[PDB]
Scaffold this active site. Structure first.
Site, mmCIF file in Angstrom:
data_model
loop_
_atom_site.group_PDB
_atom_site.id
_atom_site.type_symbol
_atom_site.label_atom_id
_atom_site.label_comp_id
_atom_site.label_asym_id
_atom_site.label_seq_id
_atom_site.Cartn_x
_atom_site.Cartn_y
_atom_site.Cartn_z
ATOM 1 N N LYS A 120 27.879 22.572 23.489
ATOM 2 C CA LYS A 120 28.942 21.601 23.310
ATOM 3 C C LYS A 120 29.844 21.545 24.543
ATOM 4 C CE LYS A 120 29.186 20.667 19.241
ATOM 5 N NZ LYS A 120 29.302 20.477 17.765
ATOM 6 N N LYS A 146 17.218 18.510 15.908
ATOM 7 C CA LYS A 146 17.693 18.202 14.553
ATOM 8 C C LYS A 146 18.453 16.882 14.548
ATOM 9 C CE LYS A 146 21.868 19.943 13.167
ATOM 10 N NZ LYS A 146 22.814 18.954 13.766
ATOM 11 N N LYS A 159 24.921 13.928 14.548
ATOM 12 C CA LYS A 159 25.884 12.853 14.682
ATOM 13 C C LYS A 159 26.090 12.582 16.173
ATOM 14 C CE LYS A 159 28.652 14.182 10.589
ATOM 15 N NZ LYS A 159 28.862 15.654 10.668
#
Ligand SMILES: Nc1ncnc2c1ncn2[C@@H]1O[C@H](COS(=O)(=O)NC(=O)[C@@H](N)Cc2c[nH]c3ccccc23)[C@@H](O)[C@H]1O
Ligand SMILES: Nc1ncnc2c1ncn2[C@@H]1O[C@H](COS(=O)(=O)NC(=O)[C@@H](N)Cc2c[nH]c3ccccc23)[C@@H](O)[C@H]1O
Lengths: 346, 334
Positions: free
Chosen positions: A112, A200, A203
């Protein structure tokens, strides 16, 4: 009496099937078997730049989705994380009890902190909330002292950090705690991206044809699935390791067939999916997946529309009080162990 | 009436720097304005600690503060752990900050297996201030960078959310904003300092303070005057002495030395300076512990209870305004 469950979901117009299959779908079984606690984790959402208007709209939209899905405020407790100052406080105790090292090795943090812009000098601009939120999570869990924490696979490291902190706290403050247990759906704990099945469903994915959003219209759902990347082995079966694409669509289909809608679809298919698709093409799989999916979405979007603003407010208002009932009790005990607060001096 | 806000961490290591830097001016501040003073225990648990020593220290600090003049009838004195608003306001400041900003902080950069709180507290301090929209934040010189970060965050949120904000103003005592270490005058007096002879603690007994001052390092010029660059040692002892002569207990001494210390010590020695400082410091340190016991465990608790309610009042109003600005909470639906 009764075993307890706690879980949090971040709101986002990007709510997708991974979220539904990951935890939402099993919510209806949980509120029947456990004392269930569920909250809109809006304190986790503001760890990155965000629009207050969007946040409000999304928090509202998530509550409606959870209701449209079957979460019953009479059987469970649904609240908004920010409505309880106890969360920020407990999250803080956890944070001061953690070290940068363990927080920096978090895989979610690495992947991230690499998802953002560099300053003019070349250094990465990382909002502090991105490093610390996993301690907030630990606190969100421990505030309700739950037996289990139903989540997706991707949330495993967090559950581990939470148990390490719980033990750390227990050892040092001799505080009576219960270690929360990580619990994921045996089959749907990790729905894959439809375009790149080696990743996966997220969002955050740039490419949206790989994600089936809960508010995606039927025509969009149709196109996305028709384009789902498969392989050139032409064999429908469960083989995560060798056929990620086909296997993924296959396990999604299985999970959707359990739904009331799709009753006819699952009957028409039988319990042996591999046997059914034994003589059919990959296109036949996409077709069946597209129907089960559209059926579900149309039925969520349908009910989701019936839920009203007032309903959301009263729901959160009651959840707030209910959740706050056990949150205060727990925080108070931690205060004793930590030596915080003034009602600690006669 | 203008508003002031400050926090002090509890610790058996409470020293003269803390007293002259902020404590001694509370008497005046609670008279000149709306004063909010709190024991910063949320900041104390940012490093390993003992829960029993914590409750004991928070308690002691309230005593010291009361014994030194803080009137619960003129000011609000509370324990920050008693308000959940602090952890929440601080969470908002934190998520609006970034790691570089915080890694830059001299304290962190020069103090780094590191406790996460050691990196985030300046964002919590920023939140403790903003929670009360104070006009001024009376602290010691060492908090300058923190107030700068508070202002940066304040403006950042003001621009991002269109929030009606009032930027806090860093305020230090002009003569005692930085009491120096008696052993090493180039360094400020600190609780952390390992050479305890350079630090006069508020609980140091008579014979101990006498011994510490008699050993205070000076220079070799044999000139008693305010000259910090060339004579940090005597200058520091001089500004300490002058500050102490303001206290009622040192009245006799004040009359003796007069209003011009450079003139008084004109014909004297460093031993004389040390002797005067010793008398003034002892009179203060023994007066403080005297009143300190005049404060019961009950008076403290009750003071904190009232401070809690009073503080929570404006803290809750400020937080609600931040909530509707960040779009947080359930009330922002309907
Ligand atoms: N592709 C996927 N397949 C299966 N499950 C998936 C998935 N992608 C996401 N999920 C799950 O969907 C759920 C909601 O997504 S999520 O909002 O990103 N989850 C989170 O961000 C959590 N960290 C929120 C949270 C905060 N405190 C908590 C305490 C307990 C449980 C969750 C939380 C989580 O259980 C995810 O693991
Ligand atoms: N040697 C010294 N000379 C003069 N002043 C000194 C000093 N050493 C420390 N001080 C001051 O003594 C006061 C208390 O010291 S202190 O507890 O170490 N300061 C702190 O720990 C702050 N982080 C407390 C704090 C938390 N939130 C706040 C909000 C506003 C103001 C202060 C705080 C502060 O104003 C220091 O600047």
């Amino acid at each position: 009496m009764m075993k307890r469950a706690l879980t949090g979901i971040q709101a986002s117009g990007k709510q997708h099937l991974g979220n539904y299959l990951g935890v939402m779908q099993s919510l209806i079984e949980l509120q029947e078997q456990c004392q269930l606690f569920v909250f809109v984790a809006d304190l986790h959402s503001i760890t990155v730049d965000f629009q207050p208007q969007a946040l409000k709209q999304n928090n509202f939209d998530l509550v409606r989705t959870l209701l449209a899905v079957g979460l019953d405020p009479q059987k469970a407790c649904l609240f908004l994380q920010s409505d309880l100052l106890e969360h920020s406080m407990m999250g803080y105790l956890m944070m001061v009890q953690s070290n940068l090292g363990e927080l920096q090795r978090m895989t979610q943090f690495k992947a991230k902190k690499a998802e953002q812009t560099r300053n003019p000098n070349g250094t990465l601009n990382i909002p502090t909330g991105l490093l610390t939120y996993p301690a907030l999570m630990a606190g969100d869990i421990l505030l309700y002292q739950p037996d289990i924490v139903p989540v997706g696979n991707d949330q495993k490291q967090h559950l581990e950090l939470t148990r390490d902190l719980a033990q750390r706290i227990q050892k040092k403050f001799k505080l009576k705690l219960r270690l929360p247990q990580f619990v994921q759906n045996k089959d749907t704990n990790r729905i894959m991206d439809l375009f790149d099945p080696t990743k996966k469903m997220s969002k955050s994915s740039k490419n949206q044809n790989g994600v089936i959003y809960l508010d995606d219209p039927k025509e969009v759902v149709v196109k996305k699935i028709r384009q789902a990347t498969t392989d050139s082995f032409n064999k429908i079966r469960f083989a995560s390791k060798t056929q990620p694409g086909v296997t993924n669509m296959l396990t999604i289909l299985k999970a959707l067939l359990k739904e009331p809608v799709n009753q006819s679809l699952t009957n028409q298919l039988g319990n042996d999916l591999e046997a059914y698709f034994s003589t059919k093409s990959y296109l036949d799989l996409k077709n069946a997946l597209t129907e089960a999916t559209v059926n579900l979405l149309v039925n969520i979007q349908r009910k989701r529309e019936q839920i009203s603003r007032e309903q959301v407010f009263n729901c959160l208002q009651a959840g707030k009080n209910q959740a706050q009932a056990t949150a205060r009790t727990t925080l108070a005990l931690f205060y004793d162990g930590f030596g915080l607060g003034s009602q600690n001096i006669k």
